[PDB]
Symmetry: C3
Subunit: 273 residues, 3 copies
């Protein structure tokens, strides 16, 4: 594995919006997608530019308490200060007792654990969250990568209805990372596409039992990911993704997966400005 | 006869579905005029098959038909947004394809369509068919892979908000089998509420079919599963296996939901088809 | 296959709490962990020491209707009465149709089905529940075993922002049995630890596709379990477990998994 070091900025975007970024003034909601290969180490300097206590906490990666991102463990960041966080990962290895310790690979995420409560409630509400992708050697890689976060009644903290439009060309390999947050329950559904329900979303071997699905529970704290071939067997056009909970979709958690023609030209019913 | 097809192809089935108002509270799909049910027909295919459906809208409302899991283009997706809905009194033609697994030019495997899927209205009352679904336009869509074992009995259980198959006066459906029969359950959640489907005295592997695929299958054995809006799954069991005949409750396990009436009976009769102690027939 | 006979006592522990115990005055919430290997049978005399109608009901195990612990099936226990419940179990076997009947093994649970409502709503609420672990031959056994029940807004009926502290020493094999109950949805999450999402939470062949997870839905009626090695690759300390539903955690569904030093001391 390799050791990588990055600086991450926590910034107030607006009254309602706090976010993480890889450069000063570049914070986004959702935050940047962080990638590691199993066994890599990532070291992050979290620069808190805000007037709030806040922090950084991951899922799935190896971290000790001093990296856990909680006030309880002395791991948060005071306003105008920087904290070093250290995330490790490992390949699968055999234990002395005969058993198998699984490698770190999976679709994970990170987010504030310190802002407004010990559980980071206000931090998450206002957008400090981001995808953490830990790859196993040999995993297939995407042309396009989308992070979808159902945060309470919001998709990626967008306004009443502006749900992100995610875009691909017909036939491209597309990676969806999906993360739930907040106090609300959701079900993530994508029209016209489907994946196997397992780590990568695709068949690993003839013995793989996993069912094919077009929809999956996305609850607070939960993350998964998968890959599809854009418009495979269905063609291009505007493909809806949304929360299948009926009053939720009506309140606007619905958005478009836009699949253009292979050459990148717009499909039938679309009006370009 | 020679010559047969150069490459094996699936079957193309053509059907008509009537969307009808049943009462002020109820809308449904049916295979014949006056034949609407809630839930509607179980539609069944094998991987590779095509299903060409004429939806005849007999109501005064805009509504549609949209599936999960099968292959459809935007013109079949069942949304107003894609010009895919059906205006009052009109007929729209929908096409649903399916495929066997295949190897991609990139070397990865495209999974075949098989699984327990479902269909339902996307156009009525909202771009999401909230009213359609609330009022009963939904049904199971079962796509099978070759060699799948076939049920003797088949039950569609839809948790739609606080109702099972929209049964709102006590009267959650009793499902029946004779002891030893292979029985198939298809579970579909709908609406705004969260559920856990639980079945007394029976259990299944949590995977596509509910049974062991090979000696490598890791899937836990379960008697209960989340069934939330949009979610379907299915499994098979041998009725009363290792347990015996009787009234076997199935219910949502959310406490306040079961207490409100989301519970029903799985009635396992004796092998010969006779009532077990406690149950009378008439 | 082994047959085992035990007495179970339903007791009122306090005003807000009912429990099961293996001895008089010994009732706890959650109740005792019942352990079986596939093929074994567990025969239970439930002694009802309360003034309330109540019952005992298993998941996963083979039981006839006479043992399903519901009023509708004549299976409940009146105040003062003693009732026999019989749970059998089996190893996998091949059916005549070629298909495979799965053995019982799993992380299961048992609870009241008769108190307050035909669904045992009051009995579940006031704490009558426990873990039922059915093991398959060759399964690895824990050094420590924790039952966590998310019951409405409570963790093991701690209603006071008192959620249990579960303890282990660094490096010990730890089993978690997770059970949901009540009317709320939850997600169970464990800091600094992860497990394969499958029956045992660990890998049995290179073919197991199961994702590795640190969090899972735990809703009413639902159970599951896994083993971890305490503090593996992460060191000892106060490691949070909690419900990831934000308003829930803020309201007190959070507790500690305390990993001590290899020698038992605090970190
Ligand atoms: C069938 O009769 C009913 C009985 C009870 C209720 C609810 O009040 C609740 C279950 O949802 O009962 C509880 C009972 C005991 C303790 C707590 C409880 O809830 C918090 C609804 C019923 O019909 C709809
Ligand atoms: Cu946490
Ligand atoms: Cu939602
Ligand atoms: Cu859909
Ligand atoms: Cu988290
Ligand atoms: Cu214009
Ligand atoms: Cu939709
Ligand atoms: Cu009515
Ligand atoms: Cu329910
Ligand atoms: Cu049960
Ligand atoms: Cu749907
Ligand atoms: Cu008569
Ligand atoms: Cu029950
Ligand atoms: Cu109290
Ligand atoms: Cu919770
Ligand atoms: Cu965490
Ligand atoms: Cu139960």
């Amino acid at each position: 594995g390799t050791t990588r070091r990055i600086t991450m900025y926590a910034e107030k975007i607006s009254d309602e919006l706090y976010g993480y970024g890889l450069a000063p003034g570049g914070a986004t909601v959702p935050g940047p997608v962080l990638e590691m290969w199993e066994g890599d180490t990532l070291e992050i300097d979290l620069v808190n530019t805000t007037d709030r206590v806040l922090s950084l906490h991951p899922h799935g990666v190896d971290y000790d308490v001093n990296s856990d991102g909680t006030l309880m463990n002395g791991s948060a960041v005071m306003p105008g200060q920087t904290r070093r966080y250290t995330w490790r990962s490992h390949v699968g290895y055999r234990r002395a007792d005969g058993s198998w310790a699984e490698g770190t690979a999976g679709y994970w995420h990170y987010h504030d654990h310190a802002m407004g409560t010990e559980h980071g409630t206000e931090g998450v509400l206002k957008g400090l969250y981001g995808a953490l992708v830990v790859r196993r050697q040999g995993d297939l890689l995407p042309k396009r990568q989308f992070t979808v976060v159902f945060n309470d009644m919001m998709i990626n903290n967008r306004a009443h209805h502006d749900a992100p439009t995610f875009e691909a060309n017909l036939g491209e390999r597309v990676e969806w990372i999906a993360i739930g947050h907040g106090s609300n329950f959701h079900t993530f559904h994508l029209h016209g596409h489907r994946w196997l329900d397992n780590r990568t979303g695709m068949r690993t071997s003839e013995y793989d039992p996993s069912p094919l699905i077009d929809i999956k529970d996305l609850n607070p704290g939960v993350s998964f990911g998968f890959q599809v071939i854009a418009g495979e067997g269905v063609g291009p056009g505007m493909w809806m993704y949304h929360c299948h909970v009926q009053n939720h979709s009506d309140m606007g958690m619905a958005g478009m997966f836009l699949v253009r023609n292979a050459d990148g030209t717009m499909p039938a019913g679309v009006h370009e400005h």
